[PDB]
Write a sequence for this structure.
């Protein structure tokens, strides 16, 4: 129906939140499935890596929360009276941030799996690896600006 | 003015991209499932002058 | 089979063509016409779909570039750790694309304006959705290509400077080319922004 | 292809290139010229990628067996590490690579019929990569041809086991050689087909070129060995000579039909390639030089899984060159120097 | 390409007269043949000294064919003049009478009719709407069919010409006669019916007519029916023409034993060649239309190049447009000779 | 407005412009990456000839300019609220299509050919006189599309 | 019926109720295969670590019950003529919990299969490796809790 | 006709039972096909485990029983007088039992083969192999409980 | 406007000219990719046939320009308003040239590289390599002529 | 317009003619791709045999015009006011002839590319080679014959 009163705006909010939350989950899962096993294949014979270079695990886990925060942010605003100008931003806002997280986690996981072996063969190199990791994380962090913009557009104004 | 409202529901502006999301999900699923495990890294033969 | 994926892709396309052609045979070639639905679409469609891609493509491309560059840097780090001071400048190229990709979202949001169901199909807002969608497409694709190209160039530099690392300046002029793409993609979108209106 | 080939394997190529960069280059062979005594070779081999393990345990007198085994120990380590970290398809490709060595190893298994050589001694005489942990095949009677069934049911080499009960079984001295040659041909053909169907096109070519050079070289060398002892049937020669040359599959049949030096000379002239006869006092040295120059083409392609194969071959031939220099110094032969490969 | 047995009629001479003209009709342009014959004349004139100096490996062989080049070129000019095409351009002043009403509106489809025909015909007047193209193309395919059947029938002439020279008329003649009838009674009948268009017209004198080219299936599916009003006794002799070709098969397939002796394996060797010749008939029958196709393609390409160059040159600009036209022709000559003759004729 | 001037005419032109930029820059990126591959291959072994054999790589932004000129020819050519000759937008799409793939073809061809050629150039400098030919020859192939784009665009505009 | 209460509103309920269970079931089965293969690989050769490594199976059971804890919960929150808005919320909640359980199932099996060998080689590393196991559990609980919040919103806000 | 009792509402049950049974059937077939080779290997190794390795096939039978019971129950839950909501619930219940059954079949085939292949070596294994067997069989229990709960609870109140 | 000339009747005219050009460009790029690599391969060794072996490259660019010339010729024959049937025929004609161009591009390169291999050491292949090339390119104009023929037919029957 | 001569019937002529041209073009190109590479070996091996080797590719060329002839033939039968019956028959004929020619090109090229090798050692082997080869273009001729029949039925029967 018209922007004034549709019957599917909350549907779109719900599916957008689902999209974002599932996106962040798998974005984390890819990096985990890479780095955790890659390291476990090393620290077994490289016991000097028990906790000194587990940073990639946390770096990846950082991205697991954006889906949750956007989902809860939209959770307060629900019902069938949300506007359509504020009824379709839900999909784009969620998916942009989610796929940004996917890509950031992919890039993080590759270098995290590389770094454990790089240090095992030469434990003086991760000084650059963590720097590249933090350079990569801001990529996923970027989408949160439009995330909050559209969240304010939607939750604050539903009509 | 809209397309056939019988073969297509009234909400034909909304039931389209849902399949695109699933397509993206499945193509990502294939690639994530494509990774290996490196069994030999932790289970392999040995010899006195060997790994 | 030769391949299930391509098999299904071939099988799917025929049915839609058959349906459309028979629909024409019943006297509906223009009755079911794309322009009809285009008139039946909404500018919010275009706005909300052309904004997520604008930044998503840029971030994905930068992620791919840095994906390449880090795995390249590790290789040269083992043999020569001092490769780092020389090579960090290169990665800056893969990072800088994302900011230029995402900035367009802010000007889009500036163009964004709550529009009622009345005048909801006119160029007052439909034009703006079209234009911002196109600009998002262009910038996203440009940033994808920029990121991938700079990543591969950085990998080349990594594998090269391992031996005779003093050749960095001899090759950075090539990475200049990869850097150009960000500017090329940004300038056209900004020019569009100087011609399009805002939502109404 | 190209970048699409790099979706998750961006580090295997990097580590392979890092290992390859450790190969001795021409500026390292400048010391090989200065290398005229065992002391100089030891001093150099305490300063290279082969450094301080060819001399830390070995004495000043550098013996061939100790030096080569020490050099190849780290190569086995690196190959096993790569195979463990290699993807499933690359894991299978590395398995086929090792299948050549373990065809040679099972050839040693079966060949033992007059000495009943110990399994440990045999695996010491071949690459340990060609030995899983054991092989309960010597339990059965070890005749000239009485274990091919046992090995086939024990080893996974049913494809690479060309039937040795058809023409390789004659209770003859040829057996301990013809079985080896036939199994080598079968494995060469199987690997050729594998690289044809897998190992994408850059890596394809990087395989087939060296595979064909090696197969033709084996053909020529075993033909010489047959001509250097009791001759064989041309059909037997074809069974021995790799039937598919993989660079030229027509002149190999000409060699097989040829049963004289002139016939093989003619079969070699039409190849439009290197001429082993009439210009080689040590044909093996020229073959090794040309083979390494050819595998350098594998490194000429930045996008190919052939990098590991070319790297292992280059390292093995470099260890061969080091041993050759050591021995010619032992015999005080300064002329046999410069036979070392000069491509890298 | 090959050789033949002793005292057999070699086909060396037929090639010299035959091949060059079929090549010529491929393009048939006065300019093209003229230029290439000029080159051949220069070659044969200068060979008094150039025969000894070497050329490019293929250039030497090219030098080795002055007679062949001149022979093809003469026929090229002949057929081009027969077609009145200087790059598909007409110069004919042989007007023989066609309805051209003096009052025409610019755009009105002013048609004509046969109010007088040049005995050779095919004059400039056939340069009009696509009706001209259809007429010309149908006429040319008819001509190709006619010449092809003539050439094939001639080739069959010498088949027995050697056996008489060998007195081998023991079993071969029994093979020549059946195939002779099989090919003739069909294709010669086709050709005579084709020229029947020149024999009689059904609109100059009101009569029913067949299609411009198709009168075929009436013989095959329908027994002894003309159903197209071509000639009366056809209704009776059509069945005859169809039927005397049936016994040829049993006649041919079994003739060896009569000349006792008999083997049983080569005995059946006849059938392969019998069916081979049978299929050869139709295959070579259909083959000849390529000549039509290539002639048409050459005509169209020449015409389009001529348009897009000359008419552009016809643009009015004399101050610096003279240089424009100079460059235009400089390009056009090079194209229309090299890239429009070399690969085509080769 | 008129059915011949609907409310989505600028859609066609702007879609064509977007396609032009994206495809031109895609070709540029692919070509420059392919050239860089050969540059990397040739660097370490003989790190001196790279300066004198920069012929392929300089072709990076040439196709980008090919696309950008066509784009700026009609960039912002339509008012923020206007309907025009719909055939004008149709041809705007058509010329973008004409120009958006010859560039890709040329970029791929030049990148791979030049990569291989320079990789093997290590040994001899004789192929220098011939290498540039194929590169410029693909450049003119791209020129085909770019010029026909303008030819069509000025027509009916 | 109406916009806020169509006859087909409970179609979403019938979908969401069955959604999460199978997602969780398949994720679990994946984890079980991936871990148990290595566990039974090591049991014969190392009969000292065979049964001191069976926390991953318990965690797999946890992710299996993740779906159940919401299945009947939303089933009994559904009616024959529910509000379509409730369907909107519940379908998203169910699919989200299912996919989170899937992600947990993927992660847990691989991490456990790696850690079991990491320990069989160096038992000193057992606690250190099993500590990281809980990351997958936390990841699974993330989507679980957010979707439960949305379920509570659906069961609290009714437009029927 | 009315959505409260359309002829195509029972169409849902016309297929739900078939799907529920078929999923378990195919899962069991795959599991048995896989485990056959392993049981053959262990038995030919020493014919003292053959009678001691029959659990996976019987467990597959029980997996099929899980679909059998729901199919039999819904056989009497069908009727021309049945609501479209009653149609939706039919698939909503019949899908999950079968899907969980096939998942359990796959997992049990995997683990049972991987264990039985090693059964002949250490009988100590047999005390532990039933562990994961039951831990997977409970998957079908989880599916069936909810499936039948929905069946009984929503087959009434047809409206 | 005219029923027989809808709004998109000129659309078909416009689009039926930007197609053959792309196909020709792709075919030429593929052919030159197949050729030039081998050309420089046989040039690095025996730097003698370099200029000799450039025949097929130029010859392939000749085909490449086919689409450009045909498209530019036909476009002038169009206008702002043209028949829907005219659009039909323009679209039908704007494809065949490029399709035959790709047909050529395949074989020309696939045979030319092999000919270059043969001729790198057997100079007698000068009569050889172009022997197949000439036969390959004759088809390169088969669709070219019909394109202009149908363009001429399109110049009439406009509405 | 009317069902007898509507606006879409001309589309058949607009497209139906461009079918056989492309199928025969692709068939000839594939035949060349197969056979032509064959010469590259025997020429260097034995430049003696250079003429007998070329027959198959020229047979493919002969086939290559079977489609062009019919296309130009039907080029006049079409128009903006034709009948859809004529379009149907024209399309059927064009498809039949073109695909038959493509099949002939397949068969002829895939046999010639090996006959080139076969005749290399035996210069007189081509006797049976030609016997086999002729059948391919003979099959193309049967492919094109019926096009003439249908077009004759398409040039006098309308509506």
């Amino acid at each position: 129906m018209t922007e004034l009163c549709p019957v599917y705006a909350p549907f779109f909010g719900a599916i957008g939140c689902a999209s974002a939350i599932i996106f962040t989950s798998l974005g984390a899962a890819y990096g985990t499935a890479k780095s955790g096993v890659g390291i476990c294949a090393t620290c077994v014979l490289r016991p000097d890596l028990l906790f000194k270079n587990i940073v990639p695990v946390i770096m990846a886990g950082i991205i697991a929360i954006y889906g949750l925060v956007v989902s809860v942010l939209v959770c307060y605003s629900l019902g069938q009276k949300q506007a359509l100008y504020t009824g379709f931003i839900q999909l784009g806002a969620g998916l942009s941030v989610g796929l940004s997280g996917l890509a950031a986690g992919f890039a993080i996981g590759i270098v995290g799996d590389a770094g454990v072996r790089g240090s095992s063969q030469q434990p003086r190199l991760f000084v650059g690896m963590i720097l590249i990791l933090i350079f990569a994380e801001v990529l996923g962090l970027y989408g949160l600006i439009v995330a909050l913009l559209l969240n304010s557009r939607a939750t604050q104004d539903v009509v | 003015d809209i397309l056939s409202s019988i073969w297509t529901e009234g909400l034909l502006m909304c039931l389209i991209v849902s399949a695109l999301l699933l397509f993206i999900l499945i193509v990502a699923l294939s690639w994530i499932s494509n990774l290996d495990i490196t069994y030999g890294a932790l289970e392999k033969s040995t010899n006195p002058i060997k790994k | 089979k030769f391949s299930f994926s391509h098999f299904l892709y071939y099988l799917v396309l025929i049915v839609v063509i058959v349906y459309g052609l028979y629909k024409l045979f019943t006297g509906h070639g223009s009755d079911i016409n794309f322009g009809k639905f285009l008139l039946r679409t909404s500018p919010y469609m275009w706005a909300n779909l052309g904004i997520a891609l604008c930044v998503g493509l840029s971030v994905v491309g930068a992620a791919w570039g840095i994906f390449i560059t880090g795995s390249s840097m590790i290789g040269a780090g083992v043999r020569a750790p001092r490769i780092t001071t020389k090579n960090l400048i290169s990665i800056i190229f893969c990072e800088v694309v994302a900011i230029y990709g995402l900035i367009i979202a802010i000007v889009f949001s500036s163009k964004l304006t709550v529009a009622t169901a009345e005048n909801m199909y006119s160029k007052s807002n439909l034009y703006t959705g079209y234009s911002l969608f196109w600009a998002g497409i262009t910038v996203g694709a440009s940033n994808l290509i920029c990121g991938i190209a700079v990543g591969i160039t950085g990998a080349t530099a990594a594998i090269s400077d391992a031996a005779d690392s003093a050749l960095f300046v001899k090759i950075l002029v090539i990475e200049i080319f990869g850097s150009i793409l960000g500017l090329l993609g940004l300038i056209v979108g900004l020019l569009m922004a100087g011609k399009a209106s805002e939502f109404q | 292809e190209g970048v699409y080939f790099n979706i998750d394997n961006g580090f295997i190529e990097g580590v392979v290139r890092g290992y390859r960069n450790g190969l001795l280059s021409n500026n390292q062979y400048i010391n090989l010229t200065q290398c005229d005594t065992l002391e100089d070779l030891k001093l150099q081999l305490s300063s290279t990628d082969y450094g301080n393990f060819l001399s830390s345990v070995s004495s000043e007198s550098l013996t061939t067996s100790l030096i080569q085994e020490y050099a190849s120990s780290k190569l086995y380590h690196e190959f096993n590490y790569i195979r463990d970290q290699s993807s499933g398809s690359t894991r299978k490709f590395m398995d086929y690579i090792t299948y050549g060595y373990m065809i040679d190893n099972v050839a040693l298994m079966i060949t033992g019929t007059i000495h009943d050589r110990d399994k440990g001694e045999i695996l010491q005489r071949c690459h340990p990569l060609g030995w899983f942990d054991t092989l309960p095949t010597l339990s059965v009677a070890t005749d000239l041809e009485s274990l091919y069934e046992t090995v086939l049911v024990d080893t996974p080499l049913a494809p690479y086991f060309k039937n040795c009960f058809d023409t390789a079984e004659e209770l003859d001295d040829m057996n301990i050689e013809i079985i080896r040659n036939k199994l080598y041909k079968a494995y060469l053909e199987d690997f050729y087909n594998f690289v044809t169907e897998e190992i994408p096109e850059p890596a394809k070519e990087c395989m087939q070129t060296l595979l064909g050079f090696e197969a033709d070289r084996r053909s020529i060398n075993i033909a010489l060995n047959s001509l250097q002892s009791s001759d064989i049937d041309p059909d037997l020669k074809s069974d021995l000579l790799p039937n598919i040359g993989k660079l030229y599959p027509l002149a190999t049949f000409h060699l097989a039909q040829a049963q004289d030096f002139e016939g093989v000379r003619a079969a070699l002239a039409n190849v439009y390639e290197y001429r082993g006869f009439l210009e080689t006092g040590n044909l093996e040295d020229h073959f090794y030089q040309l083979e390494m120059e050819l595998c350098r083409d594998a490194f000429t392609q930045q996008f190919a899984i052939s990098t590991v194969w070319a790297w292992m071959k280059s390292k093995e031939q470099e260890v061969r060159n080091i041993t050759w220099i050591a021995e010619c110094i032992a015999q005080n032969q300064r002329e046999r120097i410069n036979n070392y490969i000069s491509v890298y | 390409y090959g050789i033949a047995q002793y005292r057999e009629i070699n086909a060396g001479l037929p090639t010299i007269v035959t091949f060059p003209f079929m090549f010529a009709i491929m393009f048939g342009d006065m300019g093209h043949g003229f230029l290439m014959t000029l080159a051949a004349l220069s070659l044969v004139l200068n060979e008094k000294k150039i025969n000894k100096m070497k050329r490019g490996e293929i250039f030497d062989m090219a030098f080795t064919g002055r007679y062949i080049i001149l022979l093809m070129g003469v026929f090229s000019m002949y057929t081009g003049f027969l077609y009145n095409d200087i790059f598909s351009k007409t110069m004919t002043i042989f007007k023989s009478g066609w309805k051209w009403p003096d009052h025409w509106k610019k755009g009105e489809s002013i048609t004509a009719t046969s109010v007088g025909t040049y005995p050779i015909g095919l004059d400039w007047a056939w340069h009009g709407t696509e009706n001209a193209l259809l007429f010309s193309n149908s006429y040319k395919m008819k001509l190709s069919i006619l010449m092809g059947f003539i050439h094939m029938t001639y080739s069959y002439f010498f088949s027995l010409a050697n056996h008489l020279y060998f007195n081998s008329m023991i079993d071969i003649i029994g093979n020549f006669i059946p195939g002779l009838l099989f090919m003739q009674g069909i294709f010669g009948y086709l050709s005579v019916c084709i020229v029947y268009k020149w024999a009689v017209d059904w609109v100059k004198d009101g009569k029913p007519a067949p299609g411009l080219l198709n009168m075929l299936i009436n013989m095959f599916l329908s027994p002894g029916t003309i159903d197209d009003e071509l000639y009366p006794h056809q209704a009776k002799v059509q069945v005859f023409l169809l039927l005397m070709a049936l016994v040829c098969i049993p006649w041919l397939l079994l003739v060896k034993p009569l000349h006792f002796e008999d083997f049983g394996d080569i005995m059946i060797h006849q059938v392969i060649h019998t069916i081979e010749f049978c299929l050869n008939c139709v295959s070579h029958t259909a083959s000849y239309l390529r000549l039509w196709a290539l002639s048409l393609a050459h005509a169209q390409l020449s015409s389009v190049l001529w348009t897009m160059t000359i008419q552009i040159a016809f643009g009015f600009r004399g101050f610096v447009g003279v240089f424009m036209t100079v460059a235009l022709f400089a390009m056009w000559f090079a194209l229309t000779c090299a890239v429009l003759v070399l690969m085509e004729g080769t | 407005s008129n059915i011949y001037a609907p409310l989505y005419a600028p859609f066609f032109g702007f879609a064509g412009c977007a396609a032009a930029m994206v495809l031109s820059c895609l070709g540029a990126a692919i070509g420059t990456a392919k050239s860089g591959i050969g540059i990397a291959g040739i660097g370490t072994f003989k790190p001196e000839l790279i300066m004198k054999s920069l012929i392929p790589v300089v072709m990076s932004g040439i196709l980008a300019i090919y696309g950008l000129v066509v784009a700026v020819l009609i960039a912002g050519n339509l008012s923020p609220t206007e309907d025009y000759t719909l055939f004008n937008g149709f041809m705007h799409l058509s010329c973008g299509l004409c120009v958006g793939f010859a560039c890709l073809s040329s970029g791929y061809a030049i990148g791979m050919v030049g990569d291989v050629g320079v990789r093997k150039y290590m040994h001899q400098p004789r192929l220098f006189v011939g290498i540039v030919l194929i590169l410029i020859f693909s450049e003119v192939l791209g020129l085909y599309g770019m010029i026909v784009a303008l030819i069509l665009n000025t027509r009916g505009s």
Notes: Chain E touches chain J through 20 residues (CB under 8 Å).
